[PDB]
Amino acid sequence: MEDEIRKAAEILAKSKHAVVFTGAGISAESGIPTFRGEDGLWRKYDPEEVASISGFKRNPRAFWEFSMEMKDKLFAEPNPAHYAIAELERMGIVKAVITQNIDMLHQRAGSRRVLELHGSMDKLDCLDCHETYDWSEFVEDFNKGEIPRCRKCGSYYVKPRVVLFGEPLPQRTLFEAIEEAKHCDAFMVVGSSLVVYPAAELPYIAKKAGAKMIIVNAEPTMADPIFDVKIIGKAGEVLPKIVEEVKRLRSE
Amino acid sequence: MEDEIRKAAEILAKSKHAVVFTGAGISAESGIPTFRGEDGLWRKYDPEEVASISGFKRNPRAFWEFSMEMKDKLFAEPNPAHYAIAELERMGIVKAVITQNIDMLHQRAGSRRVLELHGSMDKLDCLDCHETYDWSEFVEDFNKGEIPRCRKCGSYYVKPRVVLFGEPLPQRTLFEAIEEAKHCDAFMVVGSSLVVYPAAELPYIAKKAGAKMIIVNAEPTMADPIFDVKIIGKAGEVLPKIVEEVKRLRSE
Amino acid sequence: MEDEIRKAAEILAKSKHAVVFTGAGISAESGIPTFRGEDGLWRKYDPEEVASISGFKRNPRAFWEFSMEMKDKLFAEPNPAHYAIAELERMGIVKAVITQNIDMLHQRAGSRRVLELHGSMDKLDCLDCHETYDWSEFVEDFNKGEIPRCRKCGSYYVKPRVVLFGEPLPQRTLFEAIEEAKHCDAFMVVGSSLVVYPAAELPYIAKKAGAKMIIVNAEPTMADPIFDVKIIGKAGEVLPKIVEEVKRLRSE
Amino acid sequence: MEDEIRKAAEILAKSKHAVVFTGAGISAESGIPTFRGEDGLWRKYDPEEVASISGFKRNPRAFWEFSMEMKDFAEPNPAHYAIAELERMGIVKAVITQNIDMLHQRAGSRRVLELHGSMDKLDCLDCHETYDWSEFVEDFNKGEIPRCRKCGSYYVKPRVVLFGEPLPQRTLFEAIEEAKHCDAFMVVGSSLVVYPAAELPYIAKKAGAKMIIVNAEPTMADPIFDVKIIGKAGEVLPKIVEEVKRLR
Amino acid sequence: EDEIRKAAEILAKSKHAVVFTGAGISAGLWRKYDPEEVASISGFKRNPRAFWEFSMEMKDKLFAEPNPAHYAIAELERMGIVKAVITQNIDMLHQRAGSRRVLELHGSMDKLDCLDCHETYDWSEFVEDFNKGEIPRCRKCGSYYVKPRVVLFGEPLPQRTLFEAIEEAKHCDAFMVVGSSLVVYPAAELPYIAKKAGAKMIIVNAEPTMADPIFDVKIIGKAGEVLPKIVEEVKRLRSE
Ligand SMILES: NC(=O)c1ccc[n+]([C@@H]2O[C@H](COP(=O)([O-])OP(=O)(O)OC[C@H]3O[C@@H](n4cnc5c(N)ncnc54)[C@H](O)[C@@H]3O)[C@@H](O)[C@H]2O)c1
Ligand SMILES: NC(=O)c1ccc[n+]([C@@H]2O[C@H](COP(=O)([O-])OP(=O)(O)OC[C@H]3O[C@@H](n4cnc5c(N)ncnc54)[C@H](O)[C@@H]3O)[C@@H](O)[C@H]2O)c1
Ligand SMILES: NC(=O)c1ccc[n+]([C@@H]2O[C@H](COP(=O)([O-])OP(=O)(O)OC[C@H]3O[C@@H](n4cnc5c(N)ncnc54)[C@H](O)[C@@H]3O)[C@@H](O)[C@H]2O)c1
Ligand SMILES: Nc1ncnc2c1ncn2[C@@H]1O[C@H](COP(=O)(O)OP(=O)(O)OC[C@H]2O[C@H](O)[C@H](O)[C@@H]2O)[C@@H](O)[C@H]1O
Ligand SMILES: [Zn+2]
Ligand SMILES: [Zn+2]
Ligand SMILES: [Zn+2]
Ligand SMILES: [Zn+2]
Ligand SMILES: [Zn+2]
Ligand SMILES: [Zn+2]
Ligand SMILES: [Zn+2]
Ligand SMILES: [Zn+2]
Ligand SMILES: [Zn+2]
């Protein structure tokens, strides 16, 4: 109920190094479907098939069609959950965001420190000649429904710098994520089923370290019982109410 | 004269996707001495306390004072070897440089693609507040014996982005280096003893993939037998000779 | 009598819960070539292509050709190293073997506790109808020049119960190995370059727990510095010498 | 007989930028069999099985064994040479060929566009690894069909255009440019039935270039030519050259 | 883009182009320091520490390196278009970027000499001490008179280098100025010499110069951003 939101807000209000872990859930209200439930059904291709380093090579066009598909929009924008987190960062509470999302919606919402376990599409590399590119370089190509193509050698294997099925995670980033869980005073999960490594392990790491924990998700997860506050609902509706309640605690 | 140099130039002049792997020996002519023993080094200091991530988190000063004592050249500049390799890239022959060095001399010399397997002294991170700095902000203070401290929070936990004991190699970079060894048509080693992974294995990976193999080192290595050309000598002297010869073949 | 061997023995002689971690190097002398250096170069095919889950499905014949390849011998049986380790367990010194090998040589040598991080060829499963099989059941088939084939449904998808490239590492067996390292009093690496996760992590975990560390390998590894005793040599020749010394030390 | 060839020498002699389009017939003199017409291979073999991509993916051993049956170490004949001399003389500017025998190069021709690729390089359809013919040249002669040394696949396809496959893009591009920028286009030993290669003669014809065709028999595309010579390339081409040295 | 395309057209058609560079490529001093004491040969013999202290305080940036304009010019030479680079810069950036024929009108810091025992040195032998804030000292005799081969007030400009640069201007087919105000000789005159000889003129600067009128192509912008773009367009005009 509203009571759970109260306790979440009370934990955050007295934290100065909170960490927020987000999954596909936090971006569903931005038009980017998750890989679960009806969303997984909605999507045509199987992510493990078309979104692997193998699939990318055998059929780059399908990879892009799958990766860019959205609900009633071409490009996504941050929803109130993203802004709510960036706000908490301005209020001196949130000092880091660890995400498995590759949509860069946290940065665009104003988050200053974002650890991207799966990278992002901010940059791309030609796998044949190694020319590097900024996302902005193919804006016109995408606009007309075409896929990225290397201007230097003509290759269609311009791979975005994200972790595809069959590749390792960014270690400098993985290490920072764990170290982040190890010294945060509050650890809040938002929009994650806590299934994809290290999502299932970070919560236990932060708890051992003594952090207070909160989880905001549309459905329950196996780790729910170890959290202090459990909230079932949409991230875009819950987070902003938590922020407001934190402001009210600091005001009144 | 020198059949080896001519042969090396012949192979390169004919390759369109060559890779260069470099070790500490390529920067010896820039003023940065190589290991020289390395075993005795661990007789003076406990490797776990001065060069491991665990030792760093326990007492930062140990790592930094260890570094000041074995400091050496801090303002070294690339030497002829580094430039020769950059020239080869400009000529459309070399497509990537894989290195174990952390001095960034390859980039400063013009190389556009450098895969740093052991990280580099480019940037540092405060482990407490996450502020990031360029090594250029601490070099001089460090040269005066001043341990770098975070200017924003005052922490003594400013960790450089280099690989320490206890932490894994940068996976995505290693992954790229290996792909590089598998599809190159020419693989050249310069100034590396090829004793420990990955230095010790990449040559064998390129060899199995069918690339031509060249090695330029001051002393033989156990991997020598698989090289099509082997040259004994100083990189800073040999490399420019090979390039000159390649240019001549190109101009005929 | 090499002094490092003697030192390794003194450590084991005073241990009552030693753990041995083995890599491909401990079976090379049994005739199973490793994936590194000359062995890797000598082997037919590229491991990641033929020994991956997709390679197995598209070309089982190549997978079995790769898996059964022998070097310097025609069939594999435990070598002196495997027996030495089994003896150390009989002497009440070694309490567990953690291995990444799938050859079952440790069990054949008599070791009772063996944690198989990558599973083993001991069991096979038809991926189509799920009939399960013992390795012994296909011995005659291999001798006649055929590859395993499900006797119940005719499929050639009889996958040995091992971890193939492209498949995740067994999580429960991984956690048991970590726990093993956290409570041993001696941790000895034999025939591993400590490159394949978690081979590079386990030694550090044991060191933090206070274990005495020993490493026996044909070449130096990146983690060599943290071990108390380092021995360069062939496992099959070194291990029995260590055990003979341990028996002498206990003689009085 | 002379009237036709005499007229042919007249055009080439006056030609400033001539292009030669060759088919399997120009290599008949070298012992290599043609595909269609008389004694053609497509009468003693099924192309859909031994020379089609669908057939290769179906049973790679068919293509490779068919290829082993044709193991014949061939050398240029007077036709290939006549074309190379016509090039040294500055008349012929480039040769577009559908053959993979590489007899045009060995004969001394510098401008050779292999519209249908060559056995020079190969690709594994499974792991995408690439190889030079030299890597299999020894197992092939011993009767062993090429097998990828990286993934063990039996789908190592040489870079030759089989039925159901597109032509190499860069090469098709170069060829069309030549068919456009030419005043003389000569076809030699080509049935002109396989497209899009057979389209080049029309592309050059519609661009205003004189058309000459030397073939051992009339092709169903003769009309487009200003003059056709029905005979053997090894005998007709050499005579075309000398007659050009008489005029020139 | 417009002027940039024209510049490329000229360079693509030329076979003996010459490039002149000033300080503006590496994008009151004499009120803070006394030039007569920190930058003249008489001041140096009087007190070498003044010149070296002046240099240390004005070192600029650490781990300095060539920028994209230097690499673009080196590339133009590699393409066989540019045959010489005349510069007033003393930081060896053109050579490091790959240029093979560089005429340094003001000398450079790459070579130094002890004025007492005449031992010669490369800058790499002092760069460490310099950046640590220690004055370069002769290791053979101990003297503090280690002077780099740069032109100091009271010393002459390299005569032979100057004449070679004058000759380049007299026989080039294209002359391109990059990052120079063209106010002081010889910088102010070389463009006029090339102009009179019949070469195509190009100038890339952040600001206009009084010599602007004689130039066939005038581009305003940062050299680091303009040159790579000119080089690209030149490659594009060679693919066709
Ligand atoms: N960058 C992206 O936006 C994006 C999109 C799809 C998948 N992926 C990534 O791929 C992996 C697998 O994805 P996945 O979807 O299977 O796992 P996930 O755990 O990241 O999935 C989302 C979870 O969100 C919950 N959820 C859905 N809508 C929500 C809302 N409005 N508010 C709060 N919670 C909501 C669901 O109950 C589900 O458990 C993850 O690592 C994920 O982050 C990224
Ligand atoms: N434990 C061991 O036995 C051992 C042995 C060697 C290296 N290592 C480790 O491996 C890493 C470094 O390996 P690396 O190969 O870069 O360095 P390295 O020190 O092993 O080898 C440098 C090589 O360069 C050669 N060399 C010296 N001057 C040269 C010049 N001017 N031109 C050309 N060659 C020259 C030497 O002969 C030597 O083989 C380090 O992290 C180190 O701790 C461990
Ligand atoms: N079950 C098997 O026998 C088997 C065989 C090959 C690979 N694999 C597995 O695949 C992975 C990768 O294999 P890899 O070979 O790249 O890694 P690895 O680290 O396991 O490789 C072997 C290491 O063995 C050392 N070595 C070789 N011969 C030796 C001997 N006689 N005595 C002592 N050391 C010796 C080498 O120096 C090298 O560092 C590992 O996890 C490995 O266990 C298993
Ligand atoms: N000595 C000779 N001189 C000139 N022409 C000759 C000679 N001997 C035979 N010919 C003629 O050469 C022509 C060759 O035609 P094809 O066999 O159809 O060969 P081509 O035009 O090269 O087209 C074949 C294409 O189909 C295959 O699938 C393959 O890919 C090949 O490139 C025939 O019309 C034949 O009569
Ligand atoms: Zn490219
Ligand atoms: Zn933090
Ligand atoms: Zn800080
Ligand atoms: Zn590459
Ligand atoms: Zn079955
Ligand atoms: Zn135990
Ligand atoms: Zn293959
Ligand atoms: Zn002196
Ligand atoms: Zn000149």
Swiss-Prot record, chains A, B, C:
Cofactor: binding comment: Binds 1 zinc ion per subunit.
Keywords carried by this UniProt record: Cytoplasm, Metal-binding, NAD, Transcription, Transcription regulation, Transferase, Zinc
Chain sites annotated for binding NAD(+): 23-42, 100-103, 191-193, 217-219, 235
Any single Gene Ontology cellular-component annotation: cytoplasm
Protein transport keyword on record: no
Root EC class: transferase
Binding site for Zn(2+): C126, C129, C150, C153
GO molecular function, one term: histone deacetylase activity, NAD-dependent
InterPro entries: DHS-like_NAD/FAD-binding_dom (IPR029035), NAD-dep_sirtuin_deacylases (IPR050134), Sirtuin (IPR003000), Sirtuin_cat_small_dom_sf (IPR026591), Sirtuin_class_III (IPR027546), Sirtuin_class_U (IPR028628), Ssirtuin_cat_dom (IPR026590)
Coiled coil: none
Presence of keyword Transmembrane helix: no
Residue span, Deacetylase sirtuin-type domain: 1-252
Cofactor list: Zn(2+)
Pfam families cross-referenced by the UniProt entry: SIR2 (PF02146)
PROSITE patterns reported in the protein's UniProt record: SIRTUIN
Reaction equation(s) it catalyzes: N(6)-acetyl-L-lysyl-[protein] + NAD(+) + H2O = 2''-O-acetyl-ADP-D-ribose + nicotinamide + L-lysyl-[protein]
Subcellular location: Cytoplasm
Family membership noted in the UniProt record: Belongs to the sirtuin family. Class III subfamily.
Note: The two SIR2 homologs in this organism, Af1 and Af2, display different substrate specificities in vitro. Af2 can deacetylate histones and peptides corresponding to the C-terminal part of p53 in a NAD-dependent manner.
UniProt name for this protein: NAD-dependent protein deacylase 2
Organism of this sequence: Archaeoglobus fulgidus (strain ATCC 49558 / DSM 4304 / JCM 9628 / NBRC 100126 / VC-16)
